[PDB]
Ligand binder design. Structure first.
Ligand SMILES: CC(C)(COP(=O)(O)OP(=O)(O)OC[C@H]1O[C@@H](n2cnc3c(N)ncnc32)[C@H](O)[C@@H]1OP(=O)(O)O)[C@@H](O)C(=O)NCCC(=O)NCCSC(=O)CC(=O)O
Ligand SMILES: CC(C)(COP(=O)(O)OP(=O)(O)OC[C@H]1O[C@@H](n2cnc3c(N)ncnc32)[C@H](O)[C@@H]1OP(=O)(O)O)[C@@H](O)C(=O)NCCC(=O)NCCSC(=O)CC(=O)O
Lengths: 427, 411, 427, 411
């Protein structure tokens, strides 16, 4: 063939999807003027409450939580009792978000007229106008910007916004996307005494991340990662998984997030429904033969062999399990059969920054970058789980080797990390 | 015109201390029942919002991290008869109490009514939750003039009164943009052995206290801060004509005046305590109780008949110092107001060194909490550096009698 | 040529966008037990209020509001005083939504396992898990569904959801997209006394719309409309238009929507900024020539001419301006020079249903379909303005002539509409 | 055991009435100062949740839309002396007061204590905000034994007592699933002239009030509702021996017994009032104040100690009917207890026809409000349909002694 390859050469390049490049991202580093230690949190709890059945419960929760002393709460939970105002929660949203976009536009050389798509997510706090309209008002973005504000979707909506900005960058060529993933802790606080609602008091901390995605080929040599796959999984059709992370009000009228005791069994079963989709996508077919050389000799001889799970350590170099709690990283390690060096970004992110809900994956990625472990061609797996039990996952591929002076949230304190973490905090 | 609108908040150290245990000295545990109430009045609190005042407290507590800790107790190695406490340096923090007062400050400074130091310092105590009680409370009271009052409620366990004052001045130096000097905690405190089963006659051995470090009085205590001027100080120096004196002419005359003034009210206060803040007895440490506590007897005539010159002559030389036997005693003791009347020498202490931006304080008064029902005399410096200020912490039965008995000499 | 013309039929055919078809929609008609008359509202206000100035204000607002006697409030504002609980807020979200999707799946034969994209928008109420997870839990949708929950984006977020579903149907072929556009009035009631926040009490009423879009070409003989354009215009960069519809808290601590007195001057300038973008897209070139020839003679002949923007009555046959208030449709009519029959769906929708925030455009479309005026090939213009002053606009083209028994929200009352709405109702 | 937790709500007509002005008759504006309180007790109130009880109120107010209207006035731009009220039929609605009482219902029915129809009905009136006051209040009280009490607060302006009871039974028939009888509001009412300036002796001209439609008596009333049994009814038929008489043995004898008991305690109750709820005098209208008001006097010996057969034959024969001059009068007229002790004939009124689903009420009592200080007597039917229930509205100083006087005859 000599002339009928241009028809193949134009049916392949117009059907190939546009690549979505992660140019750079900036994570909000909260200051040491907002850190809440163990003893400060426990004395703040002991002053406002009267019963020593809730304080002794929160002591065990916070000492088995896997957090540290540098975890930061907003400047309203430093008061006894706290002040969950609307202006105090909106000014915190102008602190964690605007300091993450200012850090991003000074390291990328980004213009505010260059941003075409703006996808902001924050679970509980959703003011009128949006946080996206707040960003548009502050940075003077264009009138034809395509802004979206996904609210109420929990701690897995960071990858929902990443998949949304991916699907918007296929329709619109030569565009930049701005993804902001935050969680405002000032209206998240629980003023009551129900024990299932006091676990979000001892877990969630300050944090945000501004993410710059693009599909231009000019920003393919400056870019850090290429988005390979985003795999979503919604276990909300089950009634046990839908009412797992449920926002209720107690019998005294205080709103809050009520976690279930069966959450870790549901978070494990939301991952294995996500593993069965992302498995054929990322595993090499050198050993994707577990379903054709091993399964065909089962239902005629013996159903059930002793377990040899698909080794995901052959498909990925880095793992970014969402830092929900200590016991959830402990279980998803044993489901994936991970080494303790693989779950090190998640553990040290929960230790240093706490359960920053929608943006823990970016603090984990900045940990893997700032340790000098992000080499060229390394594949990254970000597993993120939240409310409604959406368990979304993203596979990034590193384009260029990151140099260890990173200018991220970790560079002030990563000479001490990884810290050895005993499972209790003695008091 | 009362103080209202209290908002509580904490300031922690900016750097994590870790699992550090600050060992207390044998002198720190002798003063654990008393407290300090220091108020610093400012004319113009412009630009000094309760973020500008609270932000230098995060570098200030990195150097002074035992003040941001809590007090715990260690267990015995054999039978559990002693339990020596220590300051576990968890960064629990220092309380900040943002209050307001609609009264104007210049009227309230010159009012001479008892109960002013109690309203501007957050009156708390290492109390019924001993493991969860702060060692320092800072109250910021906004006035109708725009005037600022910083009320420092300092637990006397963690430091002395010059230690408290330099610990506050090192915060004001960070606030003013300056650089504070070195905070020395480098030699750790250790217990001693001296075999002392007998209490000195300068303290009062109170009973076993377990989880409340405050001896109650039962009466209404009242701290009355009257000002002793320069002209009445020179009138005190006319009573040694032809007589050689070694009394410091600004403390023993004034404390002798207050001694005979309360000796004309009470029956027989034959001996008194002098708690000198001696500059030579201080070591290099920044949080330590280097006081000089000692009694002094009358050893002759009554202190209600004589005059203040011979009282100062017996007050300078006849001090039997017991500041080692105070720290060496086993049981809990009461220094300030416990056994006898105490005449404190908080007069070379840099009270007016709390220049927060460029502003000298208008008026600084120090009170005490936990004083027993005998009284405490706090001879302080004034703003000019020549006159003095005396805060008398007595029961309220004899406060209005003291204002009449002192008025014959103070004019 | 006769052999190399396949390069024309491979470059042009594979670069055209996928057509998005509006198959059907279903507006929730509230029952007559939840209706609030004028006197019931002004007596429920008068019993709670100690201020006799606020009732004299709300009398004028509700009597010049353009609303009617069939406007419905949720079953928590029928109490004196109202009880804006969260269980009562979820009971309304389970009522207005699950009765509009049940109306849609019984008139289209839609299966719950056919829905691939789910875009729900509700401005103020955003629980955890979100309303999209509520729809997924009730109807037992698939685990790999792409669900989005856009909250905080005001009343113009219906067309943001339509634009999002349109852009998601370009990437995913052979897909159905469910769009739910509602507003929960139960947490939106202002329990205070500020006069700028008492206008959303007298305007916002119950209503919801569930919309089924698809890019399947098999559903081109069943569908009612084809999506032509969606034009978005975000006026949030102006500091006056950002704080025009603003959610605050008053001096007593009550949260509410504070409407400004500068709203019609902003909504008119947010519309004519949207007109300059949709103008070259839809206007016929037979009278687009004033931007090609007549603007040449501005610095050539005269500066100062006759007021004449091009006629949108030649472009579209139907108009669906968002039924915000009486003075807003009065101001967006003279800015477009519309006949009283052109602003008739908006006026009768505001009279019958009130200010349903995001679903007013679908109630107006159902009004035009109920009168039998929706013919084949007719073009519809849906204008929606909201908070942050996003002012979105969409153009649909009707595919088949709608037969007048519609089974929509209008069929119990369409024989008496249009009603001659007075300027001030009789008191 | 008081009733608590009142939650107020409204039910409207389900169809828009429009700008309709329901004209009130001349007999409606004469009874405007009085209010009906009727309680309907049910043994089992399960399955009657307060959506089940409220959903038939929306089709029931479509037929009875003046009950959901509001009182307005028609302006007269001539002289300002007449201003006739009407019912502007806006769909403002009927108050629904959800309440709950944690007492036993059967123990409270047999309490015979002054005051259960006020706690179980919402004690409101077409009040000082006349233009925004509801004409009907329905209180739904849930008991701790499972019982249910429906308390209706009906304004006598909009309807009579049989009109009120038929209006409630037409709601019970919609709730039971039955088809109610059609309601006739069709011929509109017109005012009448005739110039009667002299009020009858059956009514009392109270002062010309303008916006509060209630007369305070000064002495607080109390509805003591006792029961007239079947044995004491035919025992009252043992005093008419040797004569034939047209006295109905279940109204004239009972009200004559209560008249005897009241006149034994008061000095001279010579003239009384009989307000008959007759059926032959009714038109087809569903909301019309078609009672039969008239005065009866003794005209001779005092009724304090004569026998009740003479008073029964006197009440059934010597009635001078005045129901047309009450309506033809122009001022406020206060019929129920204003001039004389009224004796009401609510005995042919279908009280126990409030069958909710299949549940006939256990006990139905009717009280009143706005009764003047002479008293009102309401003779009602019984649950079995043979005895009588007599609610007596009296100023409270007499019900302690009516129970002493009536108990000698009622056994
Ligand atoms: C496992 C831990 C309880 C700590 O381990 P422990 O050893 O203390 O557990 P334990 O068995 O000994 O007992 C713990 C005590 O706390 C109680 N307890 C434990 N979990 C509870 C829960 N969900 N609700 C109410 N009570 C609970 C137990 O009853 C018990 O009380 P008793 O002493 O009486 O027996 C905690 O670390 C944990 O919950 N980790 C999981 C974190 C998590 O749930 N993250 C959700 C974020 S998802 C998200 O981010 C999505 C979103 O928000 O949208
Ligand atoms: C224009 C109207 C006031 C009615 O016309 P009138 O003839 O009565 O106006 P008027 O000139 O006579 O004066 C009316 C009285 O109300 C006051 N007034 C008017 N608007 C006010 C406002 N926004 N805030 C506070 N007060 C206001 C005036 O000061 C005046 O007070 P005085 O008596 O002292 O003179 C009302 O219909 C109106 O405001 N329509 C606009 C509705 C609107 O804004 N919709 C936005 C939906 S946006 C959305 O849906 C997005 C989202 O929710 O997120």
């Amino acid at each position: 063939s000599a002339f009928l390859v241009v028809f193949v050469g134009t049916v392949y390049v117009m059907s190939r999807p546009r690549p979505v490049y992660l140019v750079d991202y900036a994570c909000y580093k909260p200051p040491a003027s907002c850190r809440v230690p163990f003893a400060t949190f426990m004395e703040h709890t002991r002053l406002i409450s009267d019963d020593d059945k809730s304080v002794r419960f929160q002591t065990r929760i916070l000492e088995r939580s896997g957090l540290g002393e540098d975890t930061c709460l907003p400047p309203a939970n430093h008061y006894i009792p706290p002040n969950p105002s609307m202006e105090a929660s909106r000014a915190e949203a102008q602190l964690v978000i605007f300091s993450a976009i200012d850090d991003l536009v000074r390291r990328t050389g980004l213009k505010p007229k260059d941003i075409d798509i703006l996808v902001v997510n924050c679970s509980l706090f959703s003011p009128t106008p949006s946080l996206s309209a707040m960003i548009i008002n502050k940075y003077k973005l264009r009138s034809n910007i395509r802004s979206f504000n996904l609210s109420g979707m929990g701690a897995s909506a960071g990858l929902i916004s990443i998949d949304l900005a991916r699907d918007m960058l296929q329709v619109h060529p030569n565009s930049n996307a701005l993804v902001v993933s935050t969680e405002i802790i000032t209206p998240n606080f629980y003023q009551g005494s129900r024990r299932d609602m006091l676990l979000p008091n001892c877990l969630f901390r300050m944090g945000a991340a501004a993410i710059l995605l693009s599909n231009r080929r000019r920003e393919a040599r400056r870019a850090k990662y290429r988005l390979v796959h985003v795999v979503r999984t919604h276990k909300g059709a089950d009634d046990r998984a839908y009412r797992c992370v449920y926002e209720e009000e107690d019998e005294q009228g205080f709103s809050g997030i009520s976690l279930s005791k069966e959450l870790m069994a549901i978070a494990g079963d939301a991952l294995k429904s996500n593993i069965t989709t992302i498995g054929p996508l990322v595993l090499p077919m050198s050993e994707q033969l577990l379903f054709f050389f091993r399964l065909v000799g089962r239902k005629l001889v013996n159903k059930g062999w002793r377990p040899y799970i698909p080794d995901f350590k052959l498909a990925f170099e880095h793992f970014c399990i969402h830092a929900g709690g200590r016991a959830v990283i402990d279980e998803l390690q044993k489901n994936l059969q991970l080494s303790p060096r693989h779950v090190e970004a998640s553990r040290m992110t929960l230790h240093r920054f706490g359960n920053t809900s929608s943006s823990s994956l970016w603090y984990e990625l900045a940990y893997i970058e700032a340790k000098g472990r992000m080499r060229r061609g390394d594949r990254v797996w970000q597993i993120g789980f939240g409310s409604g039990f959406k368990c979304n996952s993203a596979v990034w591929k590193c384009l260029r080797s990151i140099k260890t002076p990173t200018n991220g949230p970790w560079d002030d304190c990563i000479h001490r990390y990884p810290v050895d973490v005993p499972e209790v905090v003695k008091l | 015109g009362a103080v209202h609108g209290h908002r509580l908040s904490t300031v922690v150290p900016s750097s994590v201390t870790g699992e550090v245990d600050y060992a207390l000295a044998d002198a720190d545990l002798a003063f654990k029942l008393h407290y300090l109430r220091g108020v610093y009045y400012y004319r113009s609190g412009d630009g000094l919002a309760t973020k500008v005042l609270k932000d230098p407290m995060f570098p200030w507590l990195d150097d002074h991290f035992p003040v941001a800790g809590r007090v715990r107790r260690a267990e015995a190695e054999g039978d559990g008869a002693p339990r020596r406490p220590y300051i576990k340096c968890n960064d629990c923090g220092v309380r900040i109490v943002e209050a307001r007062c609609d009264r104007d400050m210049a009227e309230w400074i010159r009012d001479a009514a008892p109960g002013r130091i109690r309203q501007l310092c957050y009156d708390k105590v290492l109390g019924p939750e001993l493991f969860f009680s702060p060692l320092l409370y800072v109250q910021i009271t906004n006035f109708k003039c725009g005037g600022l009052a910083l009320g420092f409620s300092w637990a006397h366990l963690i430091g002395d009164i010059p230690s408290a004052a330099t610990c506050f001045n090192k915060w004001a130096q960070i606030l003013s943009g300056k650089k504070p000097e070195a905070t020395v905690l480098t030699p750790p405190n250790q217990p001693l052995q001296g075999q002392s089963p007998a209490a000195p006659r300068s303290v009062k051995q109170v009973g076993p206290m377990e989880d409340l470090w405050l001896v109650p009085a039962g009466r209404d205590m009242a701290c009355y801060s009257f000002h002793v001027s320069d002209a009445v100080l020179k009138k005190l120096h006319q009573q040694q004509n032809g007589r050689q004196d070694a009394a410091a002419g600004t403390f023993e005359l004034v404390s002798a005046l207050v001694w005979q003034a309360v000796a004309k009210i009470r029956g027989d206060v034959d001996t008194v305590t002098v708690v000198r803040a001696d500059a030579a007895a201080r070591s290099g440490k920044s949080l330590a109780n280097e006081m000089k506590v000692g009694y002094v007897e009358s050893a002759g005539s009554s202190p209600a008949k004589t005059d203040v010159a011979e009282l100062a002559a017996l007050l300078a030389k006849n001090v039997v110092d017991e500041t080692a036997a105070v720290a060496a005693f086993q049981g809990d003791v009461l220094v300030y107001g416990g056994a006898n009347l105490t005449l404190v020498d908080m007069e070379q202490v840099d009270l007016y060194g709390l220049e927060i931006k460029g502003q000298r304080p208008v008026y600084v008064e120090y009170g005490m909490d936990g004083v027993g029902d005998e009284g405490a005399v706090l001879v302080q410096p004034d703003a000019d550096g020549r006159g003095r200020l005396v805060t008398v912490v007595l029961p309220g039965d004899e406060i209005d009698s003291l204002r009449a008995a002192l008025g014959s000499a103070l004019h």
